[PDB]
């Protein structure tokens, strides 16, 4: 029960950061450009069983485009990503969409406006209308604040399974289990960890 999801959009819009947040829960602060593409299995637990996404995180910078529209072959769903603080990334959404539906002619697609956590938003909400005539689902998202970060996958799972009432449910929590040769090893890592400051100390949590 696995589906291939292609993730397309301009370089720097946060496609890789969004996947990393779902994979490990980490927020990667640095921009290391994706080269060609990175495939990652992502599993969610639903009331209809586990759902597996094979996420094809493609590259947005043309210099690193790799196979480009070759990554889309046989895709069953897709996310198109832009950045609401960069109007050019929204201007290019019709280009990514065109290249996408030329290969995948009938798949559910989610359009995502990322980085709504930034206060100086440039692509205002009333200006985002491209999804209407193309029957895409749209979400304001932010990988940094997690605002709506689960919605693109919930909506795609509902469309791929055909159950509008599918829901994410809590995975079962097994009981966790209960040497001196590593007492000095763990203490070494423990004190360098204490002296490394936690990131984002001004956040609410």
């Amino acid at each position: 029960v696995q589906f291939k999801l292609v993730l397309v959009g301009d370089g720097g819009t946060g496609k890789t950061t969004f996947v990393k947040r779902h994979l490990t829960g980490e927020f990667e602060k640095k921009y290391v450009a994706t080269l060609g593409v990175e495939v990652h299995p992502l599993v969610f637990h639903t009331n209809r069983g586990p759902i597996k996404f094979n996420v094809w995180d493609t590259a947005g910078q043309e210099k690193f485009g790799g196979l480009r529209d070759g990554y889309y072959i046989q895709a069953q769903c897709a996310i198109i990503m832009f950045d609401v603080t960069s109007r050019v990334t929204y201007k290019n959404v019709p280009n990514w969409h065109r290249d996408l539906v030329r290969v995948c002619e009938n798949i559910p697609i989610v359009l995502c406006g990322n980085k709504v956590d930034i206060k100086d938003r440039k692509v205002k909400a009333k200006s985002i209308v491209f999804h209407r005539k193309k029957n895409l689902q749209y979400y304001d998202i932010s990988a940094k604040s997690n605002y709506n970060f689960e919605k693109p996958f919930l909506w795609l799972a509902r469309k791929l399974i055909g159950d509008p009432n599918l829901e994410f449910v809590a995975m079962p929590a097994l009981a966790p289990p209960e040497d001196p040769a590593l007492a000095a090893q763990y203490e070494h890592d423990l004190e360098v960890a204490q002296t490394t400051a936690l990131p984002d100390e001004d956040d609410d949590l």
């Binding site: 490990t24 829960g25 929590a173 289990p177 763990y186 960890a193 490394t196 400051a197």
Partner: protein, 123 residues
């Protein structure tokens, strides 16, 4: 969900970090409710924490009596401690964890409940 055979002694909103030793860096693991779960049939208390919205487990281990809560250099609302068997994502792996709360008060009360729970696991 495999949680009804347990009782909830403590519940606090928190952000959990894991230390990447090879990479000089703290990395977030999840934000959500941290619960102290006491098993009704063994009287063992564990840490269960899940991620908001997706409800994925990002912390699952017993409050071992040998663990010790240490402050971190840049926070008066966090604790750092070594964990030797966490099963949040498969096999029981060793982690250096950091856990941050909304205030110094919730951090202090977490330490209170964390060590009380250690005494129940001692018997």
């Amino acid at each position: 969900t495999m949680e009804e055979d347990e009782e909830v002694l403590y519940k606090v909103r928190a952000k959990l970090f894991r230390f990447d030793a090879d990479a000089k860096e703290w990395k977030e693991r999840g934000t959500g409710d941290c619960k102290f779960l006491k098993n009704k049939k063994t009287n063992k208390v564990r840490i269960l924490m899940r991620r908001d919205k997706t409800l994925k487990i990002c912390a699952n281990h017993i409050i071992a009596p040998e663990y010790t809560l240490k402050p971190n250099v840049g926070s008066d609302r966090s604790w750092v401690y070594a964990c030797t068997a966490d099963i949040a994502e498969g096999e029981a792996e060793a982690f250096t964890f950091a856990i941050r709360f909304g205030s110094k008060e919730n951090a202090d009360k977490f330490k209170e409940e964390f060590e009380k729970a250690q005494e129940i696991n001692k018997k």
